[PDB]
């Protein structure tokens with residue numbers, strides 16, 4: 468009985484009382500997003516492979532000798548920076564740092580949030596190719612080479628309609644799915660904002 472509503476609302480668990488982003492809950496929530504993306508097939512399932520790999524990087528960090536330093540994004544940043552465990556110019560001495568890894572998860576979260584919000588506010592039976600491509604352009608297209616940008620863009624050229632994506636959320640007919648997103652999306656948005664502010668704060672938005 469998997470449904471997207473539980474996944475989205477689970478993002479509330481990612482922020483504690485002190486507005487810190489907890490990594491374990493964040494990982495769990497992402498696994499739920501990946502399962503939804505996988506259900507879609509084609510381009511979505513393929514791109515989700517990166518997320519899976521990066522989640523496992525974070526799970527290894529969280530299960531290692533410095534585990535508690537990765538309890539929250541806040542703690543991770545303080546640990547890796549103060550101990551110089553993050554490649555600042557190019558990927559070399561710590562190419563899979565928690566900092567640069569979570570950044571890629573965070574960028575992917577941006578794309579997914581825009582896609583979902585785009586679905587929420589689109590007209591019935593809307594084509595979804597434009598929405599997918601624009602959400603991509605506004606999120607992580609800027610980090611891809613031209614030939615990759617072009618390929619992704621065309622990858623969405625023939626996509627199911629808005630209705631299919633909503634019904635895939637398994638929370639009722641389209642209209643109910645739309646209401647659900649209105650209610651649940653705020654939770655992801657909040658986690659994204661704190662994360663974004665954290666990275667902006669330490670000048671980490673362009674880690675290699």
Ligand SMILES: CCCCCCCCCCCC(=O)OC[C@H](COP(=O)([O-])O)OC(=O)CCCCCCCCCCC
Pocket residue numbers: 511514515517518571574575576578579582607614615618675
């Ligand atoms: C609505 C959708 C929401 C989706 C949310 C999830 C989106 C995930 C974000 C995209 C993931 C991604 O860009 O990964 C790039 C990876 C990793 O690179 P890096 O970010 O670690 O530097 O680099 C690689 O993957 C390298 C291998 C690339 C092989 C591709 C072969 C096909 C090339 C054909 C184009 C010409």
